[model samples]
Target: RERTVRLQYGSRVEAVYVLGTYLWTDVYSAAPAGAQTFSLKHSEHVWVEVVRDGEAEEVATNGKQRWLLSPSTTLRVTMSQASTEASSDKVTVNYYDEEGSIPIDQAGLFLTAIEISLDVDADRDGVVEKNNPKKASWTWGPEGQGAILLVNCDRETPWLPKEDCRDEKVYSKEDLKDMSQMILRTKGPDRLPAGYEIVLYISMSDSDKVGVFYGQRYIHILGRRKLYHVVKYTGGSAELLFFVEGLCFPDEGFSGLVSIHVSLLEYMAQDIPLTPIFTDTVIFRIAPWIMTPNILPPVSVFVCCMKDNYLFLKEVKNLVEKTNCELKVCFDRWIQDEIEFGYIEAPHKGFPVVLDSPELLGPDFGYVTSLDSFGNLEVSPPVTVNGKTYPLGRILIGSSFPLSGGRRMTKVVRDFLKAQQVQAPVELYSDWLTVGHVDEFMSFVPIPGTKKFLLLMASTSACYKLFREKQKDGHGEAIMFKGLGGMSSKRITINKILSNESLVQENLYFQRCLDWNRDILKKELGLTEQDIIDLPALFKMDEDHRARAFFPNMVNMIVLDKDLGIPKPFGPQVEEECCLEMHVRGLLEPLGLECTFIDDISAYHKFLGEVHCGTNVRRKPFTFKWWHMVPSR
Candidate 1:
């Protein structure tokens, strides 16, 4: 008969089956010396077992201890092992009655029990055990509650193409996806406000590249509504961050500190109350000194410093005085000291003393002159009025000097101006005079009530050279002279070029210069017969002296420097160059006065020529404000 096979576990098969091996008998003493000891090894074999109703019965046995088995006997066997100091044991067996095994459906149910056992083991000991120290888990706070993120995109997005978008472009579609993931995974879910939107503003590409969008369609977009709310309610604001390509980095990969601006858009946009925050990563490029304030209306008092040219100031003053306007001078401290002093005083006030500082100047330091309560003149410093304490904001002009001591002087002047309510003329001289050659021709005249100014440029090589030098070196005095000369040069050049032209002719100085010089040139350079005839026709002049005779009237009359209509050729006592030019043009024709270049012509000869040529009107003495030009160190 074929040998029978069966799986078994020793006695406790239903409780805990040991399938591998079991010890049958003690082998330590039974084995021969130095020979393999079966007693010590015990039984070493594979075993299979089955349990029914938690009972185990031996069906068949093989190996050293064979057990008899009946043909129809079905039994569950358990394999066990005994461990001793000398040896260990193993067992091998198979399930009896394999032909009549349990059904697949029932086995499936039994597999579930194995799964449960595995689960229990997993719970007791981790899937893979290792000594892992505990670490603190990261946690996030509520969204939109901490720092506010502001963005401006007015110059791009909806109004313009997004391709050219920058600055806030990092928050674009792809960035938004990443940011959303971060927010969802870490920041928690929070709905944004309904009015959330970004504003875009147009900006210049070169220097003031603060806004998102550039080009003609200027729009500045502020970020989402929540950002606006936080900025507005949290008492924090943003600012315009202007930048320039390179000077630091290439335009494509530009990066640096930029100025940030923050403000409520109530004034910029009337209907919408959008708050804008600026994050400029670059400093502003200071603009060169351009035209000074135009001559203001008669109701205003023009105030400036002595560092400006006397002629320039006087010209400005004359224009205002001519209109029966009042002018005042406030010689404050030097620019450098003023900046430091302003910084010191700034902390005392909620905002900075120099609100816009060099970028923006108004009536009361940096205070906005146009707004209510914040008007430049409204926040006057405290001073004595009639020996009593009085507060009045005074308009102060800071000098371009570099000395700290000069700034102290400015403070004194500023305090003095604050005390006096009634308009008064005051002049403060700097210890340091202007550098290189000085020209006395260029001057400034103040407007009465407003903050308008008029600059007069004497037409001479010295003044012209001063203007050119100013342009080249950009020195403080040079700059002042240049501004004065430019105004005069522009007026005269434009006027001369556009004479008799049918253009709108908005510039008064140019118009006047052309009207006067055209005839002067014709007379001084004596024209041919054909030229004389064509002159009257060209300028629409009367035929008595042709255009030559009318030259004096055309060239002599004074006209306001620029569009502001502030007259030039300030007064007769200025300088020889100006006096000679004025005399040739017959500027004193109405005043019954005559002049000659004493340096070129002998004094006697000059007087003789004036007497021989005859006199024009002698106008009354007029009070004029003078501007002194000071170099910025």
Candidate 2:
């Protein structure tokens, strides 16, 4: 911008002027006759230099006091002292006789020596954060704007042991790797055309706190940029080698999209041409583990103890302890510093939390039966699946027990399974048996051969016959009348309890329900008639509405392994000849199991619960995956 101006000294006035800004005053004055005229020239987008005319269009780097006139500001002139009067060649203009250009020192266009690049010393330690326990810290220099490339890991790939190392093939790798390091190299690297300087990162999401794995340190900018700086892997940091193998699993790694954020750092004019560098975002890879040989080991039976089920639990403990078989036992219940739902009449909203804990387990192989329901883990059941349990890959549970059947409870179990690696299937059944439980009438036991396991259930007809036979000698009252029912102990015969009318009526009703159940097992359950274990013992009381079956409770037995099972002994008159225990042991012969029975007769069956009812098992944990054991209905 060029202009002509005039000023008068001794005019006794202060003067001000404007040019693309508020009124500004010149620092010089020429007190002459009428007026002293001068020429000025200056423009936008230029470097600093000086001319005899003004103080090189000053720049403000100081805290305050701006000297540069803002572009596009209107030009005006004003006087404060009224001493200086100013006028420029308004009437008689004097044209210059010469045209000229001054030479300026050339320093080139862009700021030199400034670098832009992307980095991930995962710990910012300037080393490398790769392989095993994956984590990354994305950093960029010469900041500028950019976009995301491609996501490249997870669920699709099998986790290559700790020795694993691989990358996306060809352009696919380059697909999303162009986000940063200012790619000072306009041409992509030979490794992969578009791959970024920091090709990999913590392959997970931004919110996945796992980003801070290696426990990376950080200092928050606190405002505008809500970004956390991934501090350098300080002192004690080693291979940074860790993984999410167990404790919650991924046996392999994680899955997600990779994004690079190109942000603006400094501006470059027409002279300098460089692409922006991006340090933006995550490369979400998850965990590394001891995963201590991630395999399912043993099968431990965990039983809850309470007044009603304590006897059952006792019988289980005794039977399990004596077994030479690998079946282990654990005792847990509703009473804790936090609860006692088993003893609850009404103290709080009691949840059979114990069941909810190992609710999904495989302690035998390697998983311990422990759970930290969010917080108050001490209040929750402790997990113990420490390579001791084997994998069944399935959990059989009784339905209609509190949240056990709802979407809510099932989801919790599913999530828990997810936390453990391969999620196994959860099988729910009609717990509403004579005692309304899957264990009350049905259970599983491993067999030899490829046939795997067998399902057992109380045979209504089988039990009725056993009941009649036990009563035939007319010792019904002496043999059958047992324990306290309502207010006191009662001595009542089997026949007395189910006389003529109730016998036919109850028997018919029982027969129908069992038949329906039997058909269901065949259809939905896919069990053949031959595959079923028909238990034949029975028990009933004058005060009870349903029959209690054990030899009646054979189906409630715990499968210690292929060779042994723990079953409650038959009542007095019921001889071994009629026992399927011998029959079962014999049946398991050719295939593999060669089943053996451990009698738990010491504990009487006062309640319908025998073994299964009072017990839960944490079988071997198996990563035999595809295991999205969606909660079964």
Q: Which candidate has the highest TM-score of all?
A: 2
Model 2 lDDT per residue over 210-236, tens place: 221113332121111222322222111
Roughly what TM-score does model 1 have, to 2 decimal places? 0.19
lDDT of 1 at 163: 25
Task: Count clashes in each candidate, considering only residues at least 3 apart in sequence or on different chains.
Answer: 116, 94
Query: Residue 264's C-alpha lDDT in candidate 1?
Result: 19
Candidate 1 minimal-lDDT segment of 10 residues = 108-117
Across residues 43-152, which tens digit of lDDT does each residue of candidate 1 receive? Answer: 33223232234443332224332222322322232233322222222333222222333211100000000000000001111121111111111111211011111112
C-alpha-based local distance difference test score of model 1: 0.23
In candidate 1, position 457 carries an lDDT of: 30
Q: After the best TM-score superposition of candidate 2, give how far the Cα of residue 138 lies from its true spot, in angstroms.
A: 22
